[PDB]
Amino acid sequence: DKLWTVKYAPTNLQQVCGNKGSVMKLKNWLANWENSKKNSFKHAGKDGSGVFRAAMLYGPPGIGKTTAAHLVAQELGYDILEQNASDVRSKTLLNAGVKNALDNMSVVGYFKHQNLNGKHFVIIMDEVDGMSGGDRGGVGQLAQFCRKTSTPLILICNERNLPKMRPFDRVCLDIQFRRPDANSIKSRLMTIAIREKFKLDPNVIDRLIQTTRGDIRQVINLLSTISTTTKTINHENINEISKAWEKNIALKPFDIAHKMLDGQIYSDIGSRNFTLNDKIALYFDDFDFTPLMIQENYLSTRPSVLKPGQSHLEAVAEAANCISLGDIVEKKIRSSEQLWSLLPLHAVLSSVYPASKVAGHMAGRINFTAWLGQNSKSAKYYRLLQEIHYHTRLGXXXXXXXXXXXXXXXXXXXXXXXXXXXXXXXXXXXXXXXXXXXXXX
Amino acid sequence: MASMLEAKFEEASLFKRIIDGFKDCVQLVNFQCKEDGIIAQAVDDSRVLLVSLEIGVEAFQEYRCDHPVTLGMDLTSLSKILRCGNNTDTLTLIADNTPDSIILLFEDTKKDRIAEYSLKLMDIDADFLKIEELQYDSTLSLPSSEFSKIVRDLSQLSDSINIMITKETIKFVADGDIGSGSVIIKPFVDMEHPETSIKLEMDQPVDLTFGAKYLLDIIKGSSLSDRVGIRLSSEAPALFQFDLKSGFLQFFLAPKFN
Amino acid sequence: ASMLEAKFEEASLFKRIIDGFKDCVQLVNFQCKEDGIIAQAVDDSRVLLVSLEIGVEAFQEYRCDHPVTLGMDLTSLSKILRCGNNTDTLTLIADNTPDSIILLFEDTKKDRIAEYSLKLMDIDADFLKIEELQYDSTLSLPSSEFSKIVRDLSQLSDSINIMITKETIKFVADGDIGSGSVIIKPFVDMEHPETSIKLEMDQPVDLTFGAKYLLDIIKGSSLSDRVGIRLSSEAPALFQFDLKSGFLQFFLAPKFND
Amino acid sequence: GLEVLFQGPHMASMLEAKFEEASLFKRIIDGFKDCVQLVNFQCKEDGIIAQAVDDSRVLLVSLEIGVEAFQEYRCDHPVTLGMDLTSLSKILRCGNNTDTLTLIADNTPDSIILLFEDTKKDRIAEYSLKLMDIDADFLKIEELQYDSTLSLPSSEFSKIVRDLSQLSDSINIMITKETIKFVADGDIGSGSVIIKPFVDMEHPETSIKLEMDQPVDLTFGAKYLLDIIKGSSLSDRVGIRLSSEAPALFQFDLKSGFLQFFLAPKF
Ligand SMILES: Nc1ncnc2c1ncn2[C@@H]1O[C@H](COP(=O)(O)OP(=O)(O)OP(O)(O)=S)[C@@H](O)[C@H]1O
Ligand SMILES: [Mg+2]
């Protein structure tokens, strides 16, 4: 009846697939909070989680952040007072609302009372990187609370390295959540399936995760599509329903790359059963991923379409070039909300053409696009190198920094005696080091 | 001739004053309706103030309500509606079986004017609390108009207001940055006007501090009863109560840290 | 000599008048004649048009030999009009082909002369069009009794439907939070003729309007103590506000409803 | 516990002034509350003397509460009490109708006490306000003779100012041929209110007294005048004096003393 992500939502931190390291880091902080307070938050314990009034969770969509924060709170007996983007968190309302609970106790904490925190709040300011123009000065006031609160404060966001999030930098314990581990999600998904009365090839359960880029919430929803679609599952159906489901609802981006890369469609015969018009049309079946898909695996095929006496390499270079050209086209299509009339050309230059040059037998296997997550790595690191520059600009363009900050690595990693010497003799602090350490790594 | 609940407020203005009494700190609230009357509790958005209502069958010129029904409704919407009714009007609550809405009939003596409004109910998953009559260290009472002035005055000085009951004496203090605010009132009873008398049944001293914002919100019940009951205890939320000819509107305010 | 000599019995008159335009209408060219003043204008949406007619009967003296064209801004004019005490008398004064109109306030005991200048607004437009002169239904009620029903329902919808059925004036509004319906009948209180409600019907009427405008309309409730309303399917509704020697009338277009 | 007795009454004090009526002071401060922000209230054995010049530095307020405004007054040594009117306003809003207001300060003030006493002693309220340290400005007792001197009801004067202030940001005042004129040339139009010296006998309250010596014509900032009229909350009629070189003087008489603004013309 209820969505699956709901009915199968963790009930104990003992069910959060992944980030277990960060969950611990979280739970701890929420434990030593009373003491951290007792000590005026000036004793950064062996964890550092001691000089921070509030914690800042962050990471990709559907990986357990909101589940952890809530759960870690309910586990230490505290009562929860949460807000999110659906609420108005402007500086005005913020100061006329929650500001008042920063040093207050739960009225529910009484009619519930052995609980040691039952009468205390854990403020969960969720979806903070979602505070728009409907929250004037919200981040500022919120970042000010991280310094003057008298109760645990937990903030969640997806992009910690954003400009809007700058005011939060030095003010709180930011624990990172990365994309859960496949085995974790694979194991979890299995458990689900079993309880849902069905089985699935570990190769299917595997590529899903790969498509979902780790979004455990998405896979769960995506996995509830089978039983919800068909009326009655049977002994045999299980093995075949995967097809219609996988090649349609689930891994559709794959059945596209498959068809597109099948040489049988480019041979004189099939060449007219599945016309040029159809090949181009396959593109409009997911014009979002199709270009990414072809580029991803146009070089992992055993071509059957090569002209007589044409090497696999040569034909690839031709598609390589076309892939390149199609890009030029895309950029322009995305430079003017009014250029969609160029998509057909892009269909040809980014998929159909490159494909026809190497279509045939599938040597390896259709892989999801590497470009997306690969675009996260590069981006998430430019932000780092950036803040590092806006700290060394005192001592070359941000570019000349990553192409000259090589020597620095030595006199900052070399042996790790002369510790303090170089470190401080650089005008760097704690975060100035922890940050420069990440990228350099 | 088609309902499971049909109450008829003696005075329309009543139900309004009753709801304007707490529609600023609570948004969604479940109204439990049964034989004897209407009961409803709701926690604050900041989870600091608990609000409890109780409307006895003696406030309606006629009160039906066959089976027990839950009326989860948004006070802002309901408030817009009640705002409609005029003076000479007999507000009648009407609810069918397993309602999706609720009707509010504003009739008039002169049967030449009838105005009925429908109000879509809300689905509220109320965290029902177990309120239990406790033995508070101190129990005072005074004119609501006075408690109001005191609270409004002091709130201009601090975000916190300390209420001290020492040696049978009521003392409110507010210490801010611009300065401090102190008010003290001694019990008495004026036979001339019993309603302006300050009571006080102390059994043990009490020193609690409340958020000024929540008191400014509680004093809004100062339109239901000319007097306000306050029960304080070092280990429990304060209790501010307003008396209604057939019930009451009470507030449970959790204190601040020591 | 003044080609336009207009003295209002009471400066407090021309004040209640312009309050009708002020909000819904932007600029209004005032055309004067030998029998009084007339003016019209329309919403930038072309949904509502206002028609003003001021007769000399509401003047302590009128002399506009040759007709004039006084274009002016209500926000600017409404200001000049507030600078009048309840003991003064207003006097419109314009020369041959006005380049700005003059308002004169004066007392009757102490020498106090308040003369304000006011540039004139020329928009190069003077389209005065009226065509309806016979509606399927005519009703009347107190301007205050109306403005109420209006703002009440405005809370639940962007549209209000004035449904005229067999001797029953019905106002309805259906929206997101709920519905609202006010049904008042034609009644007369021998002791209070003003609060009486008259309604003469011929053919049923059913037409919805946009509360937006309907609201700006009930502001003319300042011009009188009773509003007249004439309806006719697929035809702009006419809301008229009676005045001793003239009137302020609003022509509001409905909405195609099928 | 047992020290729950206010301090104000029992402390060693150099200043202890009880008002005739709380509201009086409440009203006073309001008359100049909007112009100034921080003022130094110099208390002497004779009464209270306060002055202040707006940030723009073109308006000057001068208060003076004579010892006659007090039920009992005993300041026995010159003390300067700087304080923010915004805070003062708040304290002053806590006073009831049947409540007496006593200003108290100790021989070494770091703040000021405002004690509210009631008929039924059952209600005592003590507010303390932290003093501010302002650079006190010496009295500008300059009484340059003004070319013209007039007075009219404060209620009727306020409107004039407020009404014309709609037309322009600069109100003009002329005293030509023993006749008072208020001009306002704005963007949309013009305004002109003229009042001659009128003297009623049945209602002497409402009268316009004038004294012409030299033709007058001055222009001040309306924004300012809008605040100046606030004194309308203390005196029934306000007296104005205008000079060709000296700023404008608007006075609101009070039994004990008076509130007076010294606005400098805009050139
Ligand atoms: N790490 C995880 N372990 C187990 N189940 C998970 C995990 N992450 C997500 N889920 C499921 O996904 C649903 C939503 O997860 P949330 O923790 O609310 O996501 P989130 O990381 O806050 O995502 P946002 O709001 O898009 S940032 C839950 O109710 C779970 O069923
Ligand atoms: Mg979330």
CA nearest neighbour of A267 among A360, A168, A160: A360
Give the CATH architecture of domain D16-139: Roll (3.10)
A164 with A197, same domain: the answer is no
Ligand 1 atom 24: residue of nearest CA: A61
Q: What is the CATH number of the domain that holds A241?
A: 1.10.8.60
Q: Would you identify the CATH topology of the domain D140-267? A: DNA Polymerase III; Chain A, domain 2 (3.10.150)
* Number of domains present in the structure of chain A: 3
User: Measured on CA atoms in the order D148, D153, D159, D162, is the torsion positive or negative?
Assistant: positive
A173 with A195, same domain: the answer is no
Task: Compute the distance between CA of residue C45 and CA of residue C43 in angstroms, rounded to an integer.
Answer: 5
- Domain B2-258: give its CATH code: 3.70.10.10
Which ligand 1 atom minimizes the distance to the CA of A63? 8
Q: State how far the alpha carbon of D233 is from the alpha carbons of A29, A115, B37, D40, in Å.
A: 59, 59, 52, 22
A94 with A8, same domain: the answer is yes
CA nearest neighbour of A36 among A175, A176, A172, A177: A172
> C177 and B114 in contact by Cβ < 8 A?
no
Domain edges within chain D: 16-139, 140-267
Burial degree of A404 (CB within 10 A; 0-12, 13-18, 19+): exposed
A201 with A142, same domain: the answer is no
* B and D make contact (3+ CB pairs below 8 Å): yes
How far B68 CA sits from the closest chain C CA (Å)? 23
Q: Which contacts (CB < 8 Å, 24+ apart) does range D74-78 have?
A: D74/D15, D74/D16, D74/D17, D75/D14, D75/D15, D75/D16, D75/D17, D75/D43, D75/D44, D75/D45, D76/D14, D76/D15, D76/D45, D77/D14, D77/D45, D77/D107, D78/D42, D78/D43, D78/D44, D78/D45
Q: Would you identify the CATH topology of the domain C1-258? A: Proliferating Cell Nuclear Antigen (3.70.10)
Fold match between domain D16-139 and domain D140-267: yes
Distance A61 CA to ligand 2 centre (A): 7
Give the residue from B47, B130, B240 with the most A CB atoms within 10 Å of its CB, the best one to mutate.
B47
A209 with A279, same domain: the answer is no
Is residue A357 situated within a structural domain? yes
A170 with A58, same domain: the answer is yes
Inter-axis angle of helices A431-440 and A406-413, to 10 degrees? 120
A90 with A232, same domain: the answer is no
Amino acid identity of residue D58, one-letter, is: V
- Tell me which chain C residues have a C-beta less than 8 angstroms from the C-beta of B105: none
A173 with A184, same domain: the answer is no
A219 with A275, same domain: the answer is no
CA nearest neighbour of B136 among B233, B235, B208, B206: B233
Ligand 1 atom 29: residue of nearest CA: A9
A244 with A270, same domain: the answer is no
Is residue A384 situated within a structural domain? no
CA nearest neighbour of C238 among C212, C216, C217: C217
Q: How was this structure obtained? A: X-ray
The binding site of A for ATP consists of 5, 17, 59-67, 158
Ligand found nearest the CA of A82: 2
Block residue for tokens 């932000």: A383
- Tell me which chain B residues have a C-beta less than 8 angstroms from the C-beta of C185: 112-113
DSSP letter string, chain C = --SEEEEES-TTHHHHHHHHHHHH--EEEEEE-SSEEEEEEE-TTSSEEEEEEEEGGGEEEEE-SS-EEEEEEHHHHHHHTTS--TT-EEEEEE-SS-SEEEEEEE-SSS-EEEEEEEEPP--S-----------SEEEEE-HHHHHHHHHHHHTT-SEEEEEEETTEEEEEEE-SSEEEEEEE--EEETTEEEEEEEEEESS-EEEEEEHHHHHHHTTGGGT-S-EEEEE-TTS-EEEEEEETTEEEEEEE------
As a whole number of Å, the end-to-end CA separation of chain C is: 59
CA nearest neighbour of B51 among B257, B256, B224: B224
Range of the domain at A11: 1-179
> A104 and B129 in contact by Cβ < 8 A?
no
- Tell me which chain C residues have a C-beta less than 8 angstroms from the C-beta of B120: 177-178
| Structural tokens at position C73 | 């801004």
Chains that touch B (3 or more CB pairs under 8 A): A, C, D
Is residue A146 situated within a structural domain? yes
How far B109 CA sits from the closest chain C CA (Å)? 13
Chains that touch C (3 or more CB pairs under 8 A): B, D
Block residue for tokens 């037409």: C207
> C180 and B74 in contact by Cβ < 8 A?
no
> C118 and D159 in contact by Cβ < 8 A?
no
Kindly provide the resolution of this structure in angstroms, with one decimal.
2.8
| Structural tokens at position B145 | 């108009």
Sort strands A54-58 and A153-157 into parallel, antiparallel or unpaired: parallel
| Structural tokens at position D112 | 């000021």
**Partners of D128 in beta bridges:** B180, D113
Pocket of ligand 1 from Cβ distances under 6 Å: A 5, 8-10, 16-18, 61-67, 158, 180, 216-217, 220
Structural contact between residues C98 and C70, judged by C-beta atoms closer than 8 angstroms: yes
